[PDB]
Design a protein around this ligand. Structure first.
Ligand SMILES: [Ca+2]
Ligand SMILES: [Cl-]
Ligand SMILES: [Cl-]
Lengths: 290, 297
């Protein structure tokens, strides 16, 4: 497995739920970067250097993903809910002395991020969310067309062991197919092969696949109900925010229902912005967080 | 594999789209029985002998299923659309000299059956649909709750090879868990083990799994569109119809099924039966009786 973060250290950070792995580089204001599915912290490798020109950049594996430890789940999927993941990453950040920080997330990491902002806004200076709408909004949309497009939201959320059993036969196919599927190009040409190797090795472990299914189970159930409470309360995130999304993968209208200070923009890309459009993404983030 | 229809003959019936395999028994008015997913004709094994006391019963494997031939599909999944399957079965019945016949279908076969009724009502004297609502009705309702409860409609409809590959590592496990899951009790006790073996052997063939995915791809696309035309146009089936469904099955999970069917059909009766989604196996005596009574009247 290649080292894709020149000038970054490697830390295991203790929490009450298990270790969080991160790569850590730069100096200046702290900025936490959170990946999504079916990826690891490595997805930030094309943008984390430009950010580390200005910031102390902490590139963390989500609870249960990558090299982070895997807390034991329960019947309500609790450690893999975005509320619980957020709490665990807040504890991790406190081990480094960071109690007020900038945050950018992608895909499931973006879900952690906006949930963290909703639950504990005082922890964040500024928030960026990449390639998502709120969980609740995806579910509200979920008609025929959306059920076909984002079938994995319902498939991965099926009770165990249904998706686990299917995934075990040829996991390398499935993960590579998802990576390719969600890009504009429809192939793996947007990704560094060494990055793809990281994602494949993680996905090859049954215990890591189980976590991903627990994440999607939470997304179907507790995450949705948590979001529904905020929508019904009319709670909006107060933290200055940026929404970026791949134009092939409005979203600003949606976010304005969830956040009182939000700017954003499409970038021509599929759903892997930091790898498909690294310069544009790095530039939008540096300019937003600076 | 066991012979579950002791005394019935066989037929391998030619059509323009490939052979249809059927068991044939009894004597009297003609009655075609059409299985669904993930089954074969053998699902009728507990009701067909009773029906054969009153009817000439034709128990057919759907196009692409069981021992029927597998036509090569195309980009629109055409041979596995219900419209094309219905045309194919009409041709098979004409080979037997049946141009006007009774029809009962279960699950995908039921979907063949109502589409047949909408496209070619002259072919049918009476129609029974078991364990279903129209395809259009399932997609119209597909919100979060339903997407989570009937995930396989969207999973199996993903572009090839995604479901095919997922299914190839341990196909037995998947099919057996579906058979059990869809019953009232959640286990395989409602099935004759010999029937289950027919189902598992079918599912063990990758070509047969491909067909099942093409069937669901058609269900997501052309079948939905065909249905949409009918319901937007206000077309109803004029053929006298019976709708039966298991009280624990999905047709009733967020619908009143008779109310739904009355929107699609101008002369429909029906009832629930205490069962999951496999009526002819879970409640064979009740199902047999309801079918004999409806088709005999
Ligand atoms: Ca002939
Ligand atoms: Cl620590
Ligand atoms: Cl019975």
């Amino acid at each position: 497995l290649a080292d894709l973060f020149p000038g970054f250290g490697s830390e295991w950070i203790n929490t009450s739920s298990g270790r969080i792995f991160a790569r850590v580089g730069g100096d200046g204001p702290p900025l936490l970067l959170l990946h999504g599915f079916p990826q690891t912290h490595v997805m930030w490798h094309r943008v984390a250097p430009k950010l580390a020109e200005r910031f102390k950049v902490i590139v963390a594996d989500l609870p249960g993903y990558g090299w982070s430890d895997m807390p034991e789940s329960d019947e309500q999927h609790t450690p893999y809910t975005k509320r619980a993941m957020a709490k665990q990453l807040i504890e991790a950040m406190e081990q480094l002395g960071h109690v007020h920080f900038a945050l950018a997330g992608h895909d499931r990491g973006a879900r952690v991020s906006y949930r963290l902002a909703l639950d504990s806004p005082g922890r964040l200076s500024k928030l960026a969310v990449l390639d998502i709408l709120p969980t609740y909004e995806y579910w509200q949309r979920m008609n025929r067309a959306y059920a076909l497009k984002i079938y994995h939201w319902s498939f991965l959320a099926q009770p165990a062991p249904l998706p686990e059993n299917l995934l075990g036969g040829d996991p390398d196919f499935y993960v590579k197919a998802k990576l390719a599927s969600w890009t504009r190009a429809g192939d793996l040409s947007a990704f560094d092969p060494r990055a793809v190797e990281h994602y494949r090795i993680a996905f090859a472990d049954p215990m890591r696949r189980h976590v991903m299914c627990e994440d999607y189970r939470a997304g179907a159930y507790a995450d949705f109900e948590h979001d529904k409470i905020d929508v019904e309360a009319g709670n909006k995130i107060p933290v200055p925010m940026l929404a970026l999304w791949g134009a092939s993968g409005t979203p600003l209208d949606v976010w304005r229902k969830w956040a009182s200070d939000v700017q954003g923009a499409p970038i021509e890309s599929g759903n892997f912005l930091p790898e498909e459009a690294p310069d544009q993404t790095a530039e939008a983030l540096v300019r937003f967080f600076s």
